[PDB]
Design a protein around this nucleic acid. Structure first.
Ligand SMILES: Nc1ncnc2c1ncn2[C@@H]1O[C@H](COP(=O)(O)OC(=O)[C@@H](N)CC(=O)O)[C@@H](O)[C@H]1O
Ligand SMILES: Nc1ncnc2c1ncn2[C@@H]1O[C@H](COP(=O)(O)O)[C@@H](O)[C@H]1O
Length: 585
RNA sequence: GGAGCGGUAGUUCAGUCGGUUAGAAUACCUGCCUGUCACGCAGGGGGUCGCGGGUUCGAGUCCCGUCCGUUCCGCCA
């Protein structure tokens, strides 16, 4: 029904008859003259209506925003006067010889003249997706997947699909379940990732695998989290972590080059320990120049238990955050920050306004000065390299609270005071993550996942000293976003079994839930390692949104709902009956 | 499970430490306009303040419950 896409018409088309299909982006009725900006995915084109073609003109008067129309006309260069230089089709327009209204559009539930509410935009996602800004992110995402596939294929990775109807197994995130019609009382679990299958594909002899696959984790959301999302899943055999990182880094450098014309350069590498030490984060945003400064060894003897406790406790920490120019923060702003760190568990937010270091105690306003002394403060100021007019904030607690509260404060302040170079691209690898994480109940949980190999330990060693063991795992982070992560896998049954034991998974549960894995490990399993990227997050970064919803055609709300279709919904009892389940009273 | 913010014509935004016909923009309808491109110009109708309950002489404004969006904490192979 079309011979050309509106948005592609140029002077080079002048004199041609074309038929266009699209929508009325805008309608300008000047009485005996009507301008119709016709839109389709390639852009907007001006369609002109003269009293010369009274019929076409008269009909064109019925045109309202978003009406779907077909127009046949002649392309003619517009008078040097009128030529619009802000339109790709500016130096031309189409003289309408024929107009057809494919479909009217009722009153729009979204007014293109306003920034509409996220709720209305999701409810009428199909209308929202008509906007170029939105549409463009999806087009770009398709270019990214296209670039990924060509690259991965060119690097010998095999695109192998894995099942969505899988087995429910402990650890990780919460699984979405699918009740089985065939097996009363049994359920499938949607996959959190294809982790176990890609490892098995490795044990199958495929040597490099990848897949752009949907993942499902029944967890609440955030601006960068959706319960169903897409990974660029990757697995290799007979390769080390650095080798995996090398090709994975190359992919990302390729994507940035081809998509943004930006060369990211070699990725800096940082250990988990250093990232936590310096930024109180395992996904540090290196665009923010501020760092944390440990000052516990300076506060061991202060009387102030708020500092003395964390300072003396090896599980404690006192990290100072030097805020350039922060001395000018108002009492309001400081109270706000105080409340902000409370979100992360901090019990308070001691600070030191640095007015004049030369003046010692008299050069600094600090509700905590009274607990310190000139020496301590001078030491703190030196180690933080504080300058006149700066502010020093303190995080004093168990290691986690300090990192969470101060790492978070660090980021917030950097944005608030514009200290963070927004333009810059900051990719990095975070490596040497711990194998395990305290579960708060006396146990240990997998930092990444149970199938992650320890960096340089034997099963016996890992079992003897698990809490400190370093995993051979790694995350790729860009501008403070975790965009991907992986690890070298355990290719030895004894080690897998040892890890399950450390995790508190008894033999029964091991056989029950990972028996097929333990068994598979008995048949010449090759060393293997992989990684997975968050396609959505990569796309957010590449299209400049801070919202994951913007890179997903039909995302879910924070209530895991599809406002466009009204999912989820009550079930038909006939269905629940054949699935042998019921909603509890 | 928790905290913050929003919820006002179709859409969107404002709405004074509570004052009684609810403001506008946009949209829509009508009329005029032969070079607009955010066209312009002029007139018209439109919401009863997400929902239920309550305080009060009076509630869009306050309180409670609750629903929706959103940000965050918890949570997150
Ligand atoms: N809910 C979510 N919404 C949106 N994006 C998400 C979400 N969860 C994760 N991501 C993104 O996916 C990447 C891979 O996930 P992982 O947990 O590292 O590992 C895995 O699934 C391992 N099997 C990979 C491996 O070991 O090879 C993350 O880095 C992140 O960008
Ligand atoms: N647990 C804590 N961690 C960090 N700072 C704290 C903590 N408790 C109190 N503070 C701060 O230390 C100063 C003295 O606290 P207080 O003696 O409660 O007035 C104030 O700036 C508090 O906000």
């Amino acid at each position: 029904m079309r011979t050309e896409y509106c948005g592609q018409l140029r002077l080079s088309h002048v004199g041609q008859q074309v038929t266009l299909c699209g929508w009325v982006n805008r309608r300008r009725d000047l009485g005996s003259l009507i301008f119709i900006d016709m839109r389709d995915r390639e852009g907007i084109v001006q369609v002109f209506f003269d009293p010369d073609r009274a019929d076409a003109l008269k009909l064109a008067s019925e045109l309202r925003n978003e009406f779907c129309i077909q127009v046949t006309g002649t392309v003619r260069a517009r008078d040097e006067k009128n030529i619009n230089r802000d339109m790709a089709t500016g130096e031309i327009e189409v003289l309408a010889s024929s107009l057809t209204i494919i479909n009217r559009a009722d009153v729009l539930p979204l007014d293109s003249n306003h920034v509409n509410t996220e709720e209305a935009r999701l409810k009428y996602r199909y209308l929202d997706l008509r906007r170029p800004e939105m549409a463009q992110r999806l087009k770009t995402r398709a270019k990214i997947t296209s670039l990924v596939r060509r690259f991965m294929d060119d690097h010998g990775f095999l695109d192998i699909e894995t099942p969505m109807l899988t087995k429910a197994t402990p650890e990780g995130a919460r699984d979405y379940l699918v009740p089985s019609r065939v097996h009363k009382g049994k359920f499938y679990a949607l996959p959190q990732s294809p982790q176990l299958f890609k490892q098995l594909l490795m044990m199958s002899g495929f040597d490099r695998y990848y897949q752009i696959v949907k993942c499902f984790r029944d967890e609440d959301l955030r601006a960068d989290r959706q319960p169903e999302f897409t990974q660029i899943d990757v697995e290799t055999s007979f390769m080390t972590a650095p080798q995996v990182r090398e090709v994975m880094e190359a992919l990302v450098r390729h994507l940035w080059l081809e998509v943004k014309g930006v060369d990211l350069g070699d990725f800096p590498v940082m250990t988990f320990a250093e990232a936590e030490r310096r930024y109180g984060s395992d996904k540090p945003d290196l665009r923010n120049p501020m760092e944390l400064t440990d000052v516990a060894d300076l506060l061991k003897s202060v009387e102030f238990a708020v500092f003395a406790g964390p300072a003396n406790d090896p599980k404690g920490r006192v990290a100072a955050l030097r805020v350039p120019g922060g001395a000018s923060l108002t009492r309001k702003q400081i109270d706000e920050y105080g409340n902000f760190v409370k979100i992360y568990g901090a019990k308070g937010l001691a600070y030191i306004k640095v007015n004049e270091r030369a003046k010692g105690l008299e050069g600094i306003n600090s509700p905590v000065a009274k607990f310190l002394n000139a020496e301590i403060i001078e030491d703190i100021l030196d180690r933080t390299a504080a300058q006149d007019g700066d502010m020093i904030f303190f995080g004093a607690d168990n290691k986690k609270i300090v990192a969470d509260a101060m790492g978070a404060l660090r980021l917030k302040v950097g944005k608030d005071l514009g200290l963070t170079d927004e333009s810059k691209w900051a990719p990095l690898w975070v490596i040497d993550f711990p194998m395990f994480e305290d579960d708060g109940e006396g146990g240990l949980t997998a930092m990444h996942h149970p199938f992650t190999s320890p960096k340089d330990m034997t099963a016996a060693e890992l079992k003897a000293a698990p809490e400190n063991a370093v995993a051979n795992a790694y995350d790729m982070v860009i501008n403070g976003y975790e965009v991907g992560g992986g690890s070298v896998r355990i290719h030895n049954g004894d080690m897998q079994q040892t890890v399950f034991g450390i995790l508190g998974i008894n033999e029964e549960e091991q056989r029950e839930k990972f028996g097929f894995l333990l068994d598979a490990l008995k048949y010449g399993t090759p060393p293997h390692a992989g990684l997975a990227f968050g396609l959505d997050r990569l796309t957010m970064l590449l299209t400049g949104t801070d919202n994951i919803r913007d890179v997903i055609a039909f995302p879910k709300t924070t209530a895991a709902a599809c406002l466009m279709t009204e999912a989820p919904s009550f079930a038909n009892p006939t269905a629940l009956a054949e699935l042998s389940i019921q909603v509890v009273k």
